[PDB]
Design an enzyme around this catalytic site. Structure first.
Site, PDB file in Angstrom:
ATOM      1  N   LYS A 186       0.858  -1.182   0.000  1.00 60.33           N
ATOM      2  CA  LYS A 186       0.000   0.000   0.000  1.00 60.33           C
ATOM      3  C   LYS A 186       0.888   1.222   0.000  1.00 60.33           C
ATOM      4  CE  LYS A 186      -2.281   3.387   2.211  1.00 60.33           C
ATOM      5  NZ  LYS A 186      -1.148   4.150   1.675  1.00 60.33           N
ATOM      6  N   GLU A 262       9.644   1.270  11.257  1.00 60.26           N
ATOM      7  CA  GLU A 262      10.689   2.268  11.057  1.00 60.26           C
ATOM      8  C   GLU A 262      10.059   3.615  11.290  1.00 60.26           C
ATOM      9  OE1 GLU A 262      12.874   2.333   7.479  1.00 60.26           O
ATOM     10  OE2 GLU A 262      14.357   1.075   8.518  1.00 60.26           O
ATOM     11  N   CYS A 296      14.033  10.194   6.936  1.00 59.43           N
ATOM     12  CA  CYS A 296      13.891   9.510   8.222  1.00 59.43           C
ATOM     13  C   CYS A 296      15.046   9.873   9.139  1.00 59.43           C
ATOM     14  CB  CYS A 296      13.913   8.001   7.964  1.00 59.43           C
ATOM     15  SG  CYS A 296      12.656   7.399   6.788  1.00 59.43           S
ATOM     16  N   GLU A 393       9.860  15.870  15.962  1.00 58.67           N
ATOM     17  CA  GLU A 393      10.362  15.560  14.626  1.00 58.67           C
ATOM     18  C   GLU A 393       9.931  16.664  13.684  1.00 58.67           C
ATOM     19  OE1 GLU A 393       8.694  12.334  12.050  1.00 58.67           O
ATOM     20  OE2 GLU A 393      10.851  12.059  11.582  1.00 58.67           O
TER      21      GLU A 393
END
Lengths: 494, 494, 494, 494
Positions: A186, A262, A296, A393
């Site tokens: 997906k 992750e 990331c 973040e």
């Protein structure tokens, strides 16, 4: 040497991919795919939901049945198919690089040299493992013959994020297919096109039907249908921590499927006074600004030793001048847009937040242009650990520079996040490089470089930065299931 | 914490050990075992020869037969027996340390702490490997099931030197026994006693008869018999380069037997200006003087960058004046004797050769005492590459210091030897440490230390410093023979 | 689906290959290469000698120096080149298959489908390992950081046989290059042509100069120069046992190079009464007759249980009379010639030995034709263990059928020759398959099949059948040299 | 030699174990520990709760901080400590066996030979692994030096079941400590005593304070507090499926800690017409009734081919009537009680389901004795797949026998479970042994045997029977965290 992007790019594959043929969505629904640079609709994609995932999971489960082609072909044959998919991608490199830059707001030169190059290098790396994954013959107690088998797990659901659509696509299906699993993928709703185009190439290479299924759509409908599905053996997800938490919870409540996550990062760089300051500035800068900071492993907090702090801040501000915002496909452009309005708003609220708190703005701090989701590369100095920009973040071209005087202090401060995943360390001292990289609670530690992602190294995080490692020899084995066979025999001899 | 040596020490095992029994030599000849320093005779031991080696090989082949106790028992039991031998060695630590210091002219505190401590730790390491040696199940092409088996090789002949009788003994039998081999050992003619005493402990621990056999005697009579024997499957030898040439050559001529050699070195140390001066001086000193410089891997050549050259020589000579020569059993003695007169004359001739060739003698240069084989700690400076002491393995307490100014020059000069066993490297710079160690043609590279020998690490010699490595995971597998089994099956699945 | 062989086949490359360029022999001498089917000269090849090997070893040493492209390129890059060699081999498949058949008297369909197919498959297997060779980080005692590096060994001399010139070529150079070595290859004097043609393809794929050198010539001159060369780090040799003894001996006499040997076999088959007799006969026949019985793994001794002995021989004779001998390039021909007159003499003499030994000859037993070296497919029954044909490797289409009634005795008999390279075992019993194959002293044991030699499995040798394995994971690591690096650190953490 | 049990047995350690000191519960509550044979209170144990768990996690986290003894000692030291714990367990072997037999209603002879013997063997195996866990040096692209570190994970919570309290205790802490973790153990409410007595042995062995902490108490208070703790890095759990779902969910919602579950399967047996009937009967019962059928891997379905069906059931009923019910410490007793009343009710209702759904019961079916929870050995025949006894997990001696006619039919029925912990297979056919064992969706497949567990083989399940393995090489690496360190260097050489 970079060719120009395909002038007239045609979107060809917009439907659901199951059993190597294209499907309309069960709901008949479509959804728009935007261009994050121009805010204009590129095309519409069939919107998958739970029903489409069910079709896809049955397809993959059937393709995994005992005796079927994908289970009975030689492991090296699976390798040849993955190698051929890499060759197809090399042939269709310009097309895919254009599609990736156009749809995901990625600087074209980067999409062509690093994204596609990495995709091909990673697939060839995984291709080579297919017939080298091995089990063991074990000399256990008693008159018995014990061996193990590293079997494929089964059906693996794979949820791809929007920052590196093809790279993440290959990093997830490459190991899974090499190990002999079948997949239901997906892709992110912001960036489904490159996956769908790769599906046509998977068809061309000759993978058996159902081995790769792609169901585009939204997270809370199609991603959830994957994660809570009762016949999926593993789900792998890269993305935010909060959604990953939802994934492990849904897997636990559903059918205890294996989970690998992750999650994001708050990845620190430690720059020591004895570092090569130019290499440190270049790599730290690269580490937070590459792909508009949407990595990331973005180097979102940079700790510098007081002796060299002011010179570092000067050079960092000096380096941010070279950026050129605009259409990722136009030559000369250095920085594309952020992926969408949600991220654009988030980043802007954070930059405003830093200003309200004690923090020094050296450049940037606002949006850029009237159309698209653009953020000026912003550099904050005098950042302290208690600021929002220091805890959340960012996922934006925002750099935070902090000061440290003590080795123990900076090790504690750097590790004082719930994130692990990555870190940067700059020093020429042998002892410090080893001992500090040992102390940092991070999945990857780069020393005197940053964001040197290769296929030979396992990559994954500590703490809430994730579960599992991908793309190493260790990454390949996370797609196998271990089986111990113990056969009674009359007498054993060594 | 070091106890005093066994006051009045009596030697109880002097005969040949075969099939867990003590034997006279077929000819009846015995031979004398001397005490360095005193030059007195400790006792006479049975002299093994071809007739004796033949008895021992017959025993080892019997103990290795399919269906015998050593072949059918659990690997973990082989480990437990190795573990039992280790505890026995610890119980008898004081006795064996004295016998080792007495027979090999080894400083008693050194024999007790490092030789016995290392023997026990290595035995425990090998014990731990016995049931973790595994083969593979391989996914090869076609409808087949293929696996491998790590079988023991068979009968292993092992020729031990005099410089570290017990450590070398355990390093050879430990891996061999852990994997399930049977062994025939020929200890050095100078130092057979401690090995014989372990043979008694091997009986006590419960090893099946014939699994361990020990044949004392001379090199050109019993070692040659082992190396050219037609029913020995492997020969492992530590010693001189010429005898190694002789052994591999005989192995070729006799029966193609497996061979591992561990030869001497001219192991160089490179001290860079950015090194920690005292750590470099101290560790280089330790590496050239330990056990009267008769060490397995002695740091004979020390190349120092000119900026630091004179300061290094200063500290080296200061450290060289800190020795006390004498009986290894007397408390306070730092330097014992060389193992015999043959080695003593060799070292002294090389010292004078160095002085005649124009090297600067900084301290030492001659013998000590009227009785024993003692050599004063000698330090030469201004050594050049064409000097003999810079080309012959001195295997003595002699240090040669050289100068260098160019990195590539010194990498070339350190590699410009027919030996490649080990190397020392002293630097605080990360890049130099990693790249210079990569360029060095040495099996073991120590950085900012020296002679840090542990059991977990393999030691693999380069060039003519040997063939093979011991005591690692890699060392344990060199005592196995690989067997591939390929079984046709009606249908295979991943 | 086998195309017609090249009618034209003009042979292009006949000289010595050094540094990506063509060289005449230093002496100027050439030597003739025959066509074993017609005994007429195909062409003349430059006759290399000690001087030519010296040129080649210098070239390969230069290519292996630190800083050279072959040492500094990424391992995946070495893989990429190996894969490029495989694709080129695929492109020139028809040409190379014709050349292999012409020069080695090999049935063309076999050379095209089985030889070239395996060559491409082994190269692609080796390509995949280049960047998956890894060392270890070891948790050894003390404040140390210990890791190992798997370096390439250096210059590897590789001496190739005539039975499968391309296959052996790939099996030796594929691993050696995958690990980053450089090589000097000496192909068999009877069959140098395909190797020289492969060299041109190595040039075309882009390997740096010096990485592959080929010196055709005779064994006692150029093979000897390789084995006794003072700057060659390893020699790997495939051939007879007696010449292997010479190579191991020569390595000892000069510079102690590493040695791997794969010698002949006298590989047995054990057929149990419950075996599927139809399948057992088919595979046993194939294993002894394939490529005129010239395989290293020839199944020339077949033990059949008395219950099934006569039925087995009946079908073997029925299957053995079914060949059509003639020129290997002509379509329909089932059996080509032996490689040259020396083997033709030996095999025919052995046939005479068998008849005067009182063996029941069932079919064949003589020469065929009057041009070339052809041997009628021969089957002997009621062979006893003491017969010449029962101890000597015949290397010809000669099958020996024997009887056994007790398992214990037949394992003794099967393990009773001086060779243990391989074995076959045919049975449906689970316990029998595991236990007998464990008890058989053979490097590969096939169960209910034979000669299914894939690229993923290592095939080693026991007894005098050789030293070392190739083409497995185990096989690739023998082309690496281990180096332990031990770096002192201020404090270590688990 | 099976010795007499401890007559005068005093329970000495009954409190919470933290920092190598004994604690009262923060609330002051105790909870009773019963004897499942007599329903008499053995003693009262401190009732841990959230506060007691928080103390234990702070203790373990501190013991894991960089620079602490447990992090800085050599790996071999961790091994020597575990070995010493094993020796201590050997010394107190009678005490532990009686305490285990008394508290867990386990037949004394089994507790002494099988439970203690396995605990000691497992501990010694883990001890051998401590210094053999290694990471890799990887040849990844670019001018870099990349290695990995297998670090300890951190603080590991380990929740133990009551069926094999010591064995499960050892299988969890042995690997966790070998890798260098610190652990907080929560044993089952029914059986905390042996864990507390081992805690005392851990103090005696010299483990640093805090490396092992034990908090007795109830599952939904003390186990739950462990699984959701924000400072616990992993939870390992053996127990029921519906608790494992809760644990996995709690881990996701709190700190995304690693989770490993081992749930209990419905492990099927396939008995083929060519199987050895006697041994299949012996082992098939052995697997479902051992320890009153409360085993980790119960053989809860026995599928027999029609050809041998009736005779097999006769022998099963015949062998089932050989037990002696009573006190486990009493000499001669063969079958003890179930652990409690909650289990007793579950078992009996399942038998009622069995009769009502129409299976033929040959023996058993009811309660046994006037005291205790004892269950008659019950055998059901002609069971069908949708029956509660065939699909609902049975922890009890209830045995289910069924028939099958097609091989795939029975493979489907065997795999038609959500559990994949184990499987049994009985045949002499080589092809079926391999092909069927590959097809079974189970973590362990026994062939011609059952429940021959060991420390060398990895143990864990497929589907909803758990995730992860124990006690193998794979089992030891599950307690490590992988860290990649990538150091940019000036020039790379192979």
């Amino acid at each position: 040497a970079v060719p120009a992007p395909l002038a007239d790019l045609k979107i060809q594959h917009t439907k659901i991919f199951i059993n190597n043929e294209w499907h309309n969505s069960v709901s008949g629904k479509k959804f728009p795919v935007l261009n994050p640079a121009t805010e204009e609709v590129i095309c519409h994609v069939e919107e998958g939901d739970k029903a489409d995932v069910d079709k896809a999971v049955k397809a993959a489960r059937q393709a995994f049945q005992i005796g079927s082609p994908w289970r009975t072909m030689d492991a090296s044959e699976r390798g040849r198919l993955l190698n051929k998919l890499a060759d197809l991608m090399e042939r269709d490199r310009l097309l895919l690089a254009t599609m990736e830059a156009l749809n995901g707001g990625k600087v074209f030169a980067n999409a062509y040299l690093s994204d596609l190059g990495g995709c091909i290098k990673a697939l060839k790396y995984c291709a080579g493992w297919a017939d080298k994954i091995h089990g063991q013959t074990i000399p256990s107690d008693g008159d018995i013959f014990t061996y193990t088998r590293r079997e494929p797990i089964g059906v693996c659901g794979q949820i791809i994020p929007w920052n590196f659509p093809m790279l993440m696509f290959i990093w997830k299906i490459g190991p899974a297919l090499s190990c002999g699993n079948t997949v239901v993928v997906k892709p992110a709703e912001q960036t489904p096109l490159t996956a769908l185009h790769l599906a046509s190439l998977i068809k061309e290479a000759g993978f058996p039907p159902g081995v790769v299924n792609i169901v585009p759509g939204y997270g809370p409908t199609a991603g959830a249908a994957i994660s809570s599905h009762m016949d999926v053996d593993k789900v792998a997800f890269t993305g935010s921590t909060q959604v990953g938490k939802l994934i492990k919870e849904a897997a636990g409540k559903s059918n205890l499927k294996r989970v690998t996550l992750e999650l994001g990062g708050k990845s620190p760089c430690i720059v020591f006074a004895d570092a090569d300051l130019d290499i440190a500035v270049e790599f730290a800068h690269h580490g937070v600004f590459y792909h508009q900071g949407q990595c990331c492993v973005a180097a979102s907090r940079i700790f510098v030793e007081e002796s060299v702090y002011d010179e570092f801040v000067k050079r960092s501000v000096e380096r941010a001048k070279k950026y050129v915002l605009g259409n990722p496909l136009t030559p000369g452009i250095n920085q594309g847009p952020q992926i969408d309005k949600e991220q654009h708003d988030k980043i802007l609220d954070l930059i405003e937040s830093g200003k309200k708190e004690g923090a020094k703005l050296e450049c940037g701090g606002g949006r850029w242009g009237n159309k698209g989701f653009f953020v000026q590369p912003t550099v904050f100095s005098n950042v302290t650990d208690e600021m929002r920009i220091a805890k959340e973040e960012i996922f934006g071209p925002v750099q935070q520079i902090m000061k440290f005087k003590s080795v123990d202090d900076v090790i504690k401060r750097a590790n004082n996040t719930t994130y692990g995943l990555a870190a940067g360390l700059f020093t020429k001292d042998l002892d410090k490089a080893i001992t500090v990289s040992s102390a940092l609670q991070a999945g990857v530690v780069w020393v005197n470089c940053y964001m040197m992602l290769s296929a030979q190294c396992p990559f994954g995080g500590f703490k809430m930065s994730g579960n599992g490692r991908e793309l190493g020899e260790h990454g390949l084995y996370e797609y196998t299931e271990l089986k111990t066979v113990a056969m009674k025999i009359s007498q054993k001899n060594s």
